[PDB]
Amino acid sequence: LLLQTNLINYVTSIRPNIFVGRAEGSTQYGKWYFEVMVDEVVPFLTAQATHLRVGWALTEGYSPYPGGGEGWGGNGVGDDLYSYGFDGLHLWTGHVARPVTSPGQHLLAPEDVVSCCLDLSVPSISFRINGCPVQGVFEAFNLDGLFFPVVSFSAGVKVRFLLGGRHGEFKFLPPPGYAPCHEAVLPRERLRLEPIKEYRREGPRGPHLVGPSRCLSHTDFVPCPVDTVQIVLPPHLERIREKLAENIHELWALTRIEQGWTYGPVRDDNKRLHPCLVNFHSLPEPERNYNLQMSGETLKTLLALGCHVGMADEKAEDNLKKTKLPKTYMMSNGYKPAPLDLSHVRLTPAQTTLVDRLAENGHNVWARDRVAQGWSYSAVQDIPARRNPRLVPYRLLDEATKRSNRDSLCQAVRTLLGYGYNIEPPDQEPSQVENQSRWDRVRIFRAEKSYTVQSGRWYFEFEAVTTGEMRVGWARPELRPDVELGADELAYVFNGHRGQRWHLGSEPFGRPWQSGDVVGCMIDLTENTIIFTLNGEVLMSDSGSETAFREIEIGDGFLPVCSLGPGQVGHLNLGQDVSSLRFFAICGLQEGFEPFAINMQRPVTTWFSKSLPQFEPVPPEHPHYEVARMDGTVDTPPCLRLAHRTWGSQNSLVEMLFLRLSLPVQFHQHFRCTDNRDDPEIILNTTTYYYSVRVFAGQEPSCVWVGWVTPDYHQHDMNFDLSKVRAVTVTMGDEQGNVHSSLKCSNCYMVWGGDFVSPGQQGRISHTDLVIGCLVDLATGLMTFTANGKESNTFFQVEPNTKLFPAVFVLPTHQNVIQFELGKQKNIMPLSAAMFLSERKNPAPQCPPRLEVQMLMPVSWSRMPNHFLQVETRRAGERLGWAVQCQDPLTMMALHIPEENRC
Amino acid sequence: HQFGDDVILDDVQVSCYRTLCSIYSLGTTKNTYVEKLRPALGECLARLAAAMPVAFLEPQLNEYNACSVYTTKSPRERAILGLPNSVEEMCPDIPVLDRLMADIGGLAESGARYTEMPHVIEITLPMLCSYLPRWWERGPEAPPPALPAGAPPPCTAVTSDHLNSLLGNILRIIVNNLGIDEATWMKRLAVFAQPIVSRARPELLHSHFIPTIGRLRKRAGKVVAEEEQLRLEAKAEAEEGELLVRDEFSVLCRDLYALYPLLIRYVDNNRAHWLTEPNANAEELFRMVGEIFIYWSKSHNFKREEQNFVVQNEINNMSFLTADSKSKMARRGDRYSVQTSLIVATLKKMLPIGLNMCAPTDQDLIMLAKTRYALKDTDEEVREFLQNNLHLQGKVEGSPSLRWQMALYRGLPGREEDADDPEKIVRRVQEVSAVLYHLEQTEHPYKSKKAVWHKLLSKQRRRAVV
């Protein structure tokens, strides 16, 4: 009942820039291997034991933010359902430590070597300690994202990532088929050790605030060339494709010969030999069969794009400029090439863009075909293993290869225009990528409310290290994190990227900055004005107005605020050190404005918008959703009903809604060994509890999920389905197989209403109401469901001490959506008895005030720590690998909510 | 929109050449028609110079220029269509850039007047003002991208020196033609010359600006002294001579609106350096502008003469204030307002120099002097009042603000505590006090309900007055 306090160490996670995943058509390999070598570990640098864990983590969902989190903090590998770790004695997942048996079993100590193996096919994650097997595995986990190596640690650690080859020398041989992780570094990037989802970094003058990081997806590696299955070619293009094949083979021959190759009876990479060079006909049937289909794909794409190709000029075919290789020059063929000379031919930038897109498509078609054969990506080329550094879709391709393909295909288009066939570029068709979520895109940093100023002249500076989406200005203390700055009245901001001033909408104002520019934000509450300057120059609107905003009302007050988009970096100087203000003297000092923190001993405390969904009570005044507490009658039990206030109206908000009840039920520490009137002894000795959910007529059950969620559910998914539920299986066996235990862990236990809807070809709307019932035995850890009094096939088993909240996920299709029914079935106690100790033996259903509906909110304010762990990352050497070191301790006082198991 | 290099290529190039050379050749002709039509031709020629891709003034370096008919077209071309075969032979009547600048410098140093150099002022100077800026970006001293800079030589040879010399000579001309009763070319020359002021070097201030503003300030002092004497003697003969001082006020306002729009930009570029490293020349210019603004605030004739000049000549002053936004490219009250006035705008722009003069501790003394000015004490009177009330000067230990203000005050390089002397404090304090007092008086005129002409009686009763 009372909030608990304890001191906990800060924990930080470090990963290489290695991202591997599984997807259909993916160019990636499935099996990967890496090692971690411990050099120094201080078991107790503080009262709390040192933290060191090694494992894998998923890109989407693993967001261990510094400070508080699940449980008592110290979030690291295995503290969520997106990470899988090993501490030497245990396997970690779902913030649960499960012991695992190993020879010489001990906590991670100096000189220990941990070998981590990932197979994406099973899927399975396995470990070895000092070359010895670890008798436990993670399996059957979600593959929604990309996996990367990761180590989570507290202060007192020196560790070394060993990834293979030059970037690290393995001490124990990888198991067969498991590629070293150094082979996964992408062509455009270089191997490095980086933090995960950081909102803060150090920099020359001071800390830089960082926006969200653009991240790849498992689907990105899948090549997606344009559809061509309906391959139809006009006859004049059927004849010319073979000639195009001949000419591209000829240009290939030129590239080889100027590269210094020679006639080769046998193809071989190092020897500089290519059987293709010899003649346009003599070139082998294998290469013809390879590249004729490619030419056909090129033509069919030109058709798909909507370009019209026909015989514009017979004279171009009949007569053409005959290119002549210099008579001095010499080649192994003995036959001077002759491509179409086209210096008199001009291709417009439209056609250049089309060339780029066609090269993209050609590379992607090559990639899909070669993958279907079975090749995979590898930074190191291996032909017998069928690994290439180019089995990657065009976007990730290196600039050199991009340019090579672009030039080849541009000359192909030039040859076609020499043929004279008309080229019709298609009209530009815009599209929206939708890479990240609205909330995952923008991060807002504001000063703490205590620093609110209701009077005076105040100045502060914001330096933009990037030129992208960033907004800077003044906000009211009730600024909502989810809303973008300036859309509402709560903020008055400037967005240079487009030269805009935002307050209740966008208006042009000022000019965009360049990298390194400083924006000076000034507020005068005597004159009730806000002023913006750029590099000491006062920005002006599209008028003579020297002020961005006028007639402001002081009200509660104003606070300095900024927002950074993805890939954006800023530096906020509030003036604690006046000397560090570059443009204060030029503007503001004589005008009478004072730095925001001129005489503050400590740096201003900041809060940031955290895109970690958390459950919050439904506001009574929420425009779209209403909750009614129904008192129990003789026929009906106590209930909580959800109502859509704006249904069937313009401005109605229809989106998936995740709801839980405020209070959980906890399973026992120890599970037991192994006319409709409740029998008193049964109802008093029973350990089974019941609730139900009524889906009203008009609300589609297929759009309804009912069940329980653990307090670690943070997934706000608009396109929710039961397959998105996090899941993992921890399997423990003896030294030689013989699995003795297999436990399934998941945050969400639910049943779909579609499973109970009877199949109907028509008449999906039903006058009846669906009453889904949920039963849990708190002594056997068994969870069952009922449809309308009929037992459902679904059943779950959970471990002791598990906390479960009654949860409903629903997409509203009606004004009246759902009704939590806090009632009882015969010989089954209600949830009140489980929730409240005083009512353990009260069969009477009741809904106390504390019991309330909570709705998942995507974003919430979070205090930024004043100090951050100092982590040293380096490359010790080719053999030694990469090194991560943390030596200085940090501790925080943590406030822990027992019912929510968060801090 | 930087379209010139793509639009004006071969035949448009020839047509624009012909237009340019004809408009220039028109200079020799002298007629009433030419006098009336010269401004429009000058504007057209200036825009043509800004749009043209080639450097007709610098023909010798044409070969490096790619957007030229001579490079684009073969020598066998340009024969079918009549060309001289040489850019120089295109139309020689236009002299080269160096020759024109030498001529302009000679005119300025001689003291040539609009009558002797009407063609220059109205056609040539705008053309140069539009030519030099464009070619500065594409010539040496420009921010060079690696490959584009390293490979082709720049066709143009324009540097900031050319622009600085042109700006000095243009001033230099305005000061020669200050007193004249009729000068309509001044306002056009200012709008054409504004762009080239950004490259203006620091020395230009002491070299040119200080004498000009000093002469104008002296003339304003003489005019207001006259007005005071005319007041003192109150007659119909006093009403006579009111028109004379009026005309002096109008010519003063015309010269001010000619010079200031350039000074504002020169100030805007150098406020940062003047505030970082203190400059006595900038402080003197501040004193000048403050004196002029004081005269403006005290004399009713000067204010309304200014208003009349602006409305009659259709001066917007929007452009002068916001040409920064213009280069960016992103009812009577608005049509003209005091805040628009170049006098008050320049004073506000240069006031921070005045405050940098003043030590932060002196602020209290400044407030006392600002109230004495409200009592209408004289400058010497407030001076001696500050002199004998110096003891009141602020004490840093009492308030923390003064501590961090002193920190920066000492951080200023040239400032040392030994330089500060009681005469310095009193003089600077009373100067800034007068400026600030008149500034608040301008800002809050209390004009409300003074001379109401809402005519509520006649609006409710119009029929009866009829």
Side-chain angles (χ1 to χ4, degrees), chain A residues 1-402 404-903, chain B:
Chain A
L1 294 174
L2 296 173
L3 303 167
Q4 310 293 318
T5 52
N6 195 37
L7 287 181
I8 63 172
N9 297 337
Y10 278 99
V11 165
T12 302
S13 311
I14 288 278
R15 68 180 174 180
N17 65 5
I18 296 169
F19 307 103
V20 299
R22 176 155 72 107
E24 192 58 69
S26 171
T27 61
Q28 290 180 349
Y29 190 65
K31 299 191 222 220
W32 294 94
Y33 175 78
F34 78 96
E35 276 184 347
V36 169
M37 181 151 198
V38 186
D39 311 85
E40 290 84 65
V41 164
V42 182
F44 286 94
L45 192 69
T46 68
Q48 198 180 46
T50 311
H51 176 179
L52 187 55
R53 295 177 186 165
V54 186
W56 292 88
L58 188 61
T59 45
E60 67 96 21
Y62 184 68
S63 60
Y65 279 110
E70 289 306 296
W72 271 100
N75 284 175
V77 177
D79 287 331
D80 61 357
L81 277 186
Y82 298 95
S83 60
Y84 320 96
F86 178 61
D87 54 23
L89 301 179
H90 310 274
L91 293 179
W92 279 89
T93 196
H95 186 73
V96 175
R98 298 188 175 81
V100 69
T101 295
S102 66
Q105 186 182 0
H106 58 296
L107 185 64
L108 285 182
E111 289 90 9
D112 279 21
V113 186
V114 177
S115 297
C116 302
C117 306
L118 178 62
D119 186 352
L120 289 157
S121 84
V122 182
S124 66
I125 286 168
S126 80
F127 304 87
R128 296 181 293 173
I129 180 68
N130 286 309
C132 315
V134 186
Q135 301 156 219
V137 293
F138 295 106
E139 65 185 1
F141 43 86
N142 299 57
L143 292 159
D144 285 330
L146 297 172
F147 295 83
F148 48 91
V150 61
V151 291
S152 64
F153 53 86
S154 196
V157 293
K158 190 179 185 288
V159 289
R160 291 185 288 108
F161 275 101
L162 296 173
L163 296 160
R166 292 183 291 113
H167 294 291
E169 186 177 1
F170 293 140
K171 302 290 96 175
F172 308 100
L173 200 83
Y178 283 73
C181 288
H182 82 272
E183 301 191 351
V185 67
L186 297 171
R188 305 170 66 62
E189 290 81 2
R190 291 145 38 70
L191 184 63
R192 80 167 161 287
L193 279 68
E194 45 175 20
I196 309 162
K197 292 181 176 68
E198 67 266 37
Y199 51 86
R200 184 267 186 187
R201 68 184 65 185
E202 180 61 26
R205 305 153 64 62
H208 291 89
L209 308 172
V210 184
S213 75
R214 290 161 306 220
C215 196
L216 286 174
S217 179
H218 62 310
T219 72
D220 292 335
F221 287 87
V222 184
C224 295
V226 65
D227 198 42
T228 67
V229 65
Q230 64 275 15
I231 302 172
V232 304
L233 283 186
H236 54 279
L237 306 189
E238 292 180 353
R239 72 207 175 59
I240 197 70
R241 60 186 277 152
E242 196 278 331
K243 186 193 191 286
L244 266 73
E246 291 166 353
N247 187 5
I248 66 182
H249 285 78
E250 193 167 22
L251 305 186
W252 186 254
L254 278 73
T255 70
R256 302 283 73 75
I257 200 72
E258 278 96 15
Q259 196 170 4
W261 291 44
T262 68
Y263 178 79
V266 66
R267 204 183 296 205
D268 167 35
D269 297 332
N270 215 321
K271 181 60 67 67
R272 303 295 77 182
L273 281 195
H274 214 293
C276 190
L277 170 60
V278 59
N279 185 246
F280 68 90
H281 282 327
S282 175
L283 60 84
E285 290 281 332
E287 289 77 2
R288 315 176 214 193
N289 303 334
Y290 298 152
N291 300 274
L292 269 293
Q293 284 67 239
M294 299 264 174
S295 177
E297 177 65 18
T298 69
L299 276 299
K300 176 62 185 180
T301 55
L302 275 297
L303 296 173
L305 279 72
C307 180
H308 186 271
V309 179
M311 187 66 204
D313 279 305
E314 186 63 88
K315 64 92 177 178
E317 294 290 330
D318 293 340
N319 189 10
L320 59 87
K321 278 74 171 178
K322 182 65 123 178
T323 306
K324 179 68 72 175
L325 276 295
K327 280 75 66 178
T328 57
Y329 188 78
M330 213 32 225
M331 66 182 179
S332 62
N333 186 355
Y335 180 68
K336 308 263 181 293
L340 285 72
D341 181 273
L342 302 167
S343 78
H344 76 305
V345 173
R346 300 294 75 186
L347 280 189
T348 76
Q351 291 83 18
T352 75
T353 300
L354 305 101
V355 161
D356 295 332
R357 295 179 66 250
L358 277 296
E360 184 179 1
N361 188 10
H363 185 76
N364 295 1
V365 162
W366 162 82
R368 72 172 166 179
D369 292 331
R370 189 65 66 79
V371 169
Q373 301 172 33
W375 280 67
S376 70
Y377 172 68
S378 167
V380 183
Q381 189 193 81
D382 202 13
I383 306 298
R386 296 173 55 182
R387 317 286 298 281
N388 200 9
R390 297 186 296 279
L391 275 296
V392 70
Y394 202 69
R395 295 179 66 250
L396 303 186
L397 214 49
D398 52 293
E399 289 322 282
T401 305
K402 271 184 179 105
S404 78
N405 293 20
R406 185 177 65 247
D407 307 329
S408 71
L409 183 63
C410 192
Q411 295 294 321
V413 187
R414 289 196 143 270
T415 302
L416 288 157
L417 186 60
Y419 296 145
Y421 299 169
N422 60 3
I423 297 92
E424 196 278 333
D427 49 340
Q428 183 268 332
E429 291 324 295
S431 180
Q432 198 267 329
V433 63
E434 191 65 26
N435 189 358
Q436 293 180 355
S437 297
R438 310 284 62 71
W439 332 114
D440 189 16
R441 186 179 295 276
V442 68
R443 204 169 286 161
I444 308 175
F445 310 83
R446 72 166 165 69
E448 187 153 59
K449 289 189 219 183
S450 72
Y451 298 93
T452 290
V453 299
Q454 294 179 356
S455 67
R457 293 179 179 86
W458 304 108
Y459 178 92
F460 82 83
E461 266 173 23
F462 175 80
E463 172 166 31
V465 188
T466 59
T467 75
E469 179 48 68
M470 282 166 302
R471 283 172 210 197
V472 62
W474 303 89
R476 295 198 188 280
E478 310 80 26
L479 177 81
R480 305 185 39 62
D482 57 356
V483 171
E484 184 67 26
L485 294 181
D488 49 19
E489 60 274 351
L490 294 177
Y492 307 74
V493 292
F494 170 63
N495 180 31
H497 191 26
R498 298 294 296 163
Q500 303 169 307
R501 64 182 165 170
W502 295 71
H503 178 245
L504 274 166
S506 158
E507 294 81 3
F509 178 94
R511 64 184 186 272
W513 40 66
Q514 287 72 39
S515 178
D517 285 4
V518 181
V519 189
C521 308
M522 287 147 84
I523 190 162
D524 200 333
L525 299 172
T526 61
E527 285 75 359
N528 299 73
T529 62
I530 297 170
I531 298 91
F532 294 116
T533 64
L534 187 80
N535 301 357
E537 315 305 302
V538 184
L539 304 155
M540 294 182 286
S541 55
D542 63 357
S543 66
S545 76
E546 201 80 15
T547 51
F549 303 99
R550 291 145 301 277
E551 292 90 8
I552 62 171
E553 60 283 343
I554 281 155
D556 51 1
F558 292 92
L559 277 165
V561 69
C562 78
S563 62
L564 283 70
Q568 301 311 310
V569 191
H571 173 218
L572 207 65
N573 196 344
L574 292 195
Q576 184 176 2
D577 172 34
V578 66
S579 67
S580 71
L581 290 175
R582 284 151 68 157
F583 297 107
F584 188 53
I586 295 91
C587 184
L589 172 64
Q590 314 296 337
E591 290 79 2
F593 285 76
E594 295 178 353
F596 190 82
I598 188 64
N599 276 339
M600 291 179 184
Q601 312 282 82
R602 295 182 298 279
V604 168
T605 287
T606 62
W607 289 58
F608 76 108
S609 67
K610 181 149 104 170
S611 48
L612 179 70
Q614 308 259 34
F615 274 106
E616 285 175 28
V618 172
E621 69 283 331
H622 188 286
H624 305 285
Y625 304 128
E626 195 263 344
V627 174
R629 316 190 47 110
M630 295 296 172
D631 292 331
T633 75
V634 293
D635 54 353
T636 73
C639 289
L640 297 165
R641 184 180 45 101
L642 182 65
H644 207 291
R645 301 184 200 192
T646 64
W647 188 254
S649 179
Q650 188 274 331
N651 78 336
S652 75
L653 171 80
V654 177
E655 66 185 1
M656 264 285 310
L657 190 55
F658 305 83
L659 302 165
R660 74 176 181 181
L661 286 197
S662 47
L663 288 163
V665 303
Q666 187 147 33
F667 291 78
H668 298 167
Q669 179 62 249
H670 313 291
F671 288 168
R672 68 182 65 186
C673 294
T674 299
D675 199 359
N676 189 355
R677 262 103 34 93
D678 309 336
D679 194 0
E681 64 91 12
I682 287 163
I683 194 58
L684 277 296
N685 289 269
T686 190
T687 59
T688 309
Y689 305 87
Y690 175 83
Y691 75 94
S692 65
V693 179
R694 172 174 312 263
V695 188
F696 295 117
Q699 176 59 45
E700 292 294 328
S702 66
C703 297
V704 177
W705 292 262
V706 169
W708 315 76
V709 300
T710 70
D712 64 357
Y713 187 87
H714 297 297
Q715 178 174 357
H716 207 56
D717 183 24
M718 292 301 97
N719 313 291
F720 179 78
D721 62 271
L722 278 185
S723 67
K724 318 280 206 81
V725 164
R726 294 308 101 164
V728 69
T729 307
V730 179
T731 299
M732 295 296 172
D734 70 1
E735 290 83 3
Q736 66 280 11
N738 285 320
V739 172
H740 65 279
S741 67
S742 179
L743 294 174
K744 295 176 73 69
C745 298
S746 179
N747 46 4
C748 184
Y749 306 95
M750 293 206 162
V751 291
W752 188 41
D755 293 331
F756 309 128
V757 177
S758 77
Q761 70 280 15
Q762 196 262 343
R764 314 320 308 118
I765 62 169
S766 166
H767 64 288
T768 63
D769 293 332
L770 179 62
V771 186
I772 310 170
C774 317
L775 288 74
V776 298
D777 196 283
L778 295 190
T780 73
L782 190 64
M783 312 165 48
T784 58
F785 299 84
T786 63
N788 283 318
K790 279 74 70 176
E791 180 56 36
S792 185
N793 292 318
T794 60
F795 84 93
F796 301 111
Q797 168 76 46
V798 300
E799 310 180 29
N801 298 115
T802 299
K803 281 195 217 215
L804 275 177
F805 300 76
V808 177
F809 300 166
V810 63
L811 171 73
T813 74
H814 195 243
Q815 318 94 44
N816 281 278
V817 176
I818 60 172
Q819 206 180 38
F820 289 91
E821 295 179 353
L822 300 170
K824 60 186 301 295
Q825 299 310 278
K826 178 202 206 319
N827 284 338
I828 297 168
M829 284 280 255
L831 290 182
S832 71
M835 282 169 173
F836 309 97
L837 184 78
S838 66
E839 321 294 315
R840 291 285 186 266
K841 303 294 183 182
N842 190 353
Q846 68 176 3
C847 174
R850 199 164 165 211
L851 209 43
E852 80 199 333
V853 181
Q854 296 179 337
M855 70 184 281
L856 203 58
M857 303 287 188
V859 181
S860 309
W861 288 111
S862 175
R863 202 176 163 286
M864 294 176 70
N866 294 106
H867 305 284
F868 290 86
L869 270 183
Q870 310 288 299
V871 182
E872 300 86 64
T873 57
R874 63 185 293 272
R875 189 180 191 188
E878 295 183 354
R879 295 179 66 250
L880 292 172
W882 293 78
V884 179
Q885 185 176 2
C886 199
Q887 293 326 110
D888 286 341
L890 292 175
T891 291
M892 64 179 288
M893 185 180 288
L895 188 66
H896 170 92
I897 296 90
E899 57 260 40
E900 291 158 50
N901 205 21
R902 52 191 289 269
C903 66
Chain B
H1 302 81
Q2 316 295 125
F3 289 165
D5 307 346
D6 289 328
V7 188
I8 304 152
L9 276 172
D10 303 296
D11 70 276
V12 185
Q13 207 185 354
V14 187
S15 297
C16 292
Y17 269 120
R18 297 173 33 187
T19 300
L20 182 151
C21 312
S22 47
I23 295 179
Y24 200 81
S25 70
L26 186 68
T28 187
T29 303
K30 301 296 187 292
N31 282 317
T32 294
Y33 296 174
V34 183
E35 291 292 329
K36 300 289 94 175
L37 278 294
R38 186 177 298 115
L41 293 159
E43 202 181 337
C44 200
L45 188 56
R47 305 292 185 257
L48 186 144
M52 293 177 71
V54 310
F56 60 94
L57 299 181
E58 295 153 320
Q60 63 278 11
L61 293 150
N62 194 230
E63 70 277 16
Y64 305 134
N65 180 214
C67 295
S68 187
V69 66
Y70 277 92
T71 54
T72 58
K73 300 294 183 183
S74 179
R76 88 50 202 171
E77 292 148 23
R78 303 177 270 123
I80 59 175
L81 72 164
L83 272 295
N85 202 38
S86 170
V87 299
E88 293 80 7
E89 292 184 64
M90 183 63 73
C91 64
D93 63 304
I94 296 89
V96 294
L97 190 44
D98 303 331
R99 179 65 178 86
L100 293 174
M101 293 180 183
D103 296 331
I104 294 150
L107 293 147
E109 59 91 12
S110 66
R113 305 284 288 266
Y114 176 75
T115 75
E116 294 84 2
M117 52 172 237
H119 181 54
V120 191
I121 295 167
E122 296 257 29
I123 295 170
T124 299
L125 280 178
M127 183 179 71
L128 296 170
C129 284
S130 307
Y131 176 96
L132 294 185
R134 184 179 187 262
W135 286 115
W136 188 83
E137 294 179 353
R138 306 151 206 281
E141 185 175 1
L147 275 294
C155 63
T156 187
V158 177
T159 74
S160 297
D161 283 331
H162 294 85
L163 294 89
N164 195 56
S165 297
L166 193 66
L167 186 62
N169 276 322
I170 295 167
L171 291 167
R172 219 119 329 38
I173 291 151
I174 296 169
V175 301
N176 308 334
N177 296 254
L178 266 167
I180 56 177
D181 291 331
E182 186 270 332
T184 60
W185 51 273
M186 287 188 166
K187 64 179 181 292
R188 299 187 292 264
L189 199 45
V191 299
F192 291 132
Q194 277 191 134
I196 60 169
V197 75
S198 50
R199 311 305 317 141
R201 294 206 185 270
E203 294 82 3
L204 186 64
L205 189 65
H206 188 51
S207 83
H208 288 87
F209 267 119
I210 301 297
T212 65
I213 305 293
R215 294 187 64 229
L216 277 185
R217 184 271 307 278
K218 183 65 68 66
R219 290 164 35 137
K222 298 199 271 211
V223 178
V224 302
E226 294 150 0
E227 214 194 331
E228 172 54 62
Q229 188 274 331
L230 283 72
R231 179 66 66 192
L232 188 153
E233 60 86 19
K235 278 72 95 177
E237 192 276 332
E239 292 181 354
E240 187 66 26
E242 190 69 23
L243 277 296
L244 284 97
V245 304
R246 183 66 60 84
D247 312 327
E248 295 170 279
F249 274 135
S250 74
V251 300
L252 192 69
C253 291
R254 176 206 67 198
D255 306 325
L256 281 180
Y257 271 85
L259 282 189
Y260 273 19
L262 311 186
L263 184 56
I264 294 171
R265 307 234 185 275
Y266 185 77
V267 162
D268 292 350
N269 312 130
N270 300 269
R271 289 177 64 189
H273 159 254
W274 291 341
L275 272 175
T276 285
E277 192 277 331
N279 202 353
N281 299 332
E283 291 169 352
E284 182 65 26
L285 195 71
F286 170 69
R287 295 198 196 68
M288 284 152 173
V289 299
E291 284 157 284
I292 291 161
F293 166 79
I294 291 169
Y295 292 138
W296 178 86
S297 288
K298 282 201 262 192
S299 178
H300 187 193
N301 284 15
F302 182 76
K303 296 185 206 38
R304 62 180 291 165
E305 288 294 302
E306 195 211 342
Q307 181 150 45
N308 287 321
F309 175 87
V310 179
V311 300
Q312 291 177 356
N313 301 258
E314 284 85 39
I315 318 297
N316 191 1
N317 291 318
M318 208 39 225
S319 73
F320 303 136
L321 305 167
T322 61
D324 293 331
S325 297
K326 297 295 186 292
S327 63
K328 213 169 95 155
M329 183 177 176
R331 79 196 185 305
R332 75 284 187 190
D334 186 73
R335 188 63 207 64
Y336 180 76
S337 297
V338 301
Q339 64 92 21
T340 71
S341 178
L342 289 197
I343 299 168
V344 302
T346 301
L347 183 86
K348 292 186 289 293
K349 267 151 199 293
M350 293 177 70
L351 183 63
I353 314 292
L355 306 163
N356 195 24
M357 293 183 286
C358 282
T361 187
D362 291 331
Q363 183 151 12
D364 58 358
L365 290 197
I366 294 171
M367 294 299 291
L368 288 84
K370 189 157 81 183
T371 70
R372 302 258 297 157
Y373 278 117
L375 310 177
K376 282 76 176 175
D377 299 328
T378 62
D379 284 17
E380 195 46 78
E381 184 170 2
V382 305
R383 183 173 301 108
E384 53 82 15
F385 182 76
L386 292 160
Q387 185 55 281
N388 59 347
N389 293 260
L390 282 184
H391 62 283
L392 188 153
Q393 153 185 9
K395 278 74 178 173
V396 56
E397 68 273 16
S399 184
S401 67
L402 277 296
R403 187 169 305 126
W404 81 256
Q405 284 137 16
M406 285 316 88
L408 297 183
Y409 192 77
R410 280 75 179 272
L412 282 151
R415 299 289 175 73
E416 297 88 6
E417 296 298 326
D418 62 359
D420 302 84
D421 305 293
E423 63 274 24
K424 310 278 165 298
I425 297 86
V426 304
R427 295 179 66 250
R428 85 184 169 224
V429 165
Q430 62 90 26
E431 285 145 29
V432 186
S433 298
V435 177
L436 290 159
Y437 179 45
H438 288 100
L439 193 50
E440 291 104 15
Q441 297 295 320
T442 313
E443 272 160 338
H444 54 67
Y446 312 122
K447 182 65 179 70
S448 67
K449 66 183 178 300
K450 299 295 182 293
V452 163
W453 60 81
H454 195 323
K455 63 178 74 172
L456 286 79
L457 75 167
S458 87
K459 188 266 179 183
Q460 187 270 328
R461 182 68 277 171
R462 171 67 180 262
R463 184 67 183 84
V465 66
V466 174

